[PDB]
Amino acid sequence: AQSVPWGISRVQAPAAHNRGLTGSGVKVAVLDTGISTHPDLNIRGGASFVPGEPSTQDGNGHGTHVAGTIAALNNSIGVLGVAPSAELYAVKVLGASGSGSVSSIAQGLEWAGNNGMHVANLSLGSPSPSATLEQAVNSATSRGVLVVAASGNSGAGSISYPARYANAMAVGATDQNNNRASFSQYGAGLDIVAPGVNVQSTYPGSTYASLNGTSMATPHVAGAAALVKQKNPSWSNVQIRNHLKNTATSLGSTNLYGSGLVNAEAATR
Ligand SMILES: [Ca+2]
Numbered sequence: 001a002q003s004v005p006w007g008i009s010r011v012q013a014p015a016a017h018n019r020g021l022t023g024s025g026v027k028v029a030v031l032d033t034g035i036s037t038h039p040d041l042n043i044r045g046g047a048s049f050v051p052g053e054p055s056t057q058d059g060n061g062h063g064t065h066v067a068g069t070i071a072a073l074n075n076s077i078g079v080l081g082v083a084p085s086a087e088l089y090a091v092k093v094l095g096a097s098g099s100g101s102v103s104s105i106a107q108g109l110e111w112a113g114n115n116g117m118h119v120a121n122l123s124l125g126s127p128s129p130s131a132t133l134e135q136a137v138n139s140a141t142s143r144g145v146l147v148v149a150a151s152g153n154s155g156a157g158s159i160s161y162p163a164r165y166a167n168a169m170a171v172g173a174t175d176q177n178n179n180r181a182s183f184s185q186y187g188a189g190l191d192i193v194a195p196g197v198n199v200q201s202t203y204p205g206s207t208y209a210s211l212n213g214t215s216m217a218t219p220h221v222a223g224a225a226a227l228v229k230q231k232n233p234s235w236s237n238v239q240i241r242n243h244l245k246n247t248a249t250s251l252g253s254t255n256l257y258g259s260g261l262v263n264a265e266a267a268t269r
């Protein structure tokens, strides 16, 4: 049996699916620990920028989980993504421990731009700024990619990098009461929030697992962007980003929530 995780319902993805919107034709790069082959995922391509590791398979689990929130297949098993027909690309920029570097993340962003990705999901952070990182975000954006990045899990009133850079759409996490999760970073640069507590998704070894984090919120927004892109194929990254914000459900102050809770039904009306 297929289960619909609470966050998928909370962002109203099933209503978009009922209008025939699934993310078909939209290329979504997952810049993460990899993506493992799984009966509830389709992986269309990718590249690894982790030294010594040619495989894009997931050595950790995190990237497979993120990928399933974006695009777990709509069938009779497992879970269900926001954009279950999105074309997933596994862009491995984080090693098995979850660590990365500015250079691996930047290389993945440049790859996403050069390979015509429409959305790049960055469920990752760096605590300190990096001009190589901001420049890579800007490069991908200039080529047409919508970069979507996690605000971070430190609980602080500033957000992580690259989410803090203007051309990354920064995503915080909400709980089942539609409150900001206590760990979800907020402040200057935050754009939007999405479910990030007790999020069930795909995991390696043909399993499923439940995780908490802004890394889980981010793919709800990446998936919603793919639904908007399928409906509006001529729209740019910016147009999609601002439509998601303009159709979000306000949750209160923009400092804490950005524009509020992403709403895939409102965004595809
Ligand atoms: Ca499924």
Ligand code: NA
Binding pocket: 162, 163, 164, 165, 166, 167, 168, 169, 170, 189, 190
């Ligand atoms: Na930003």
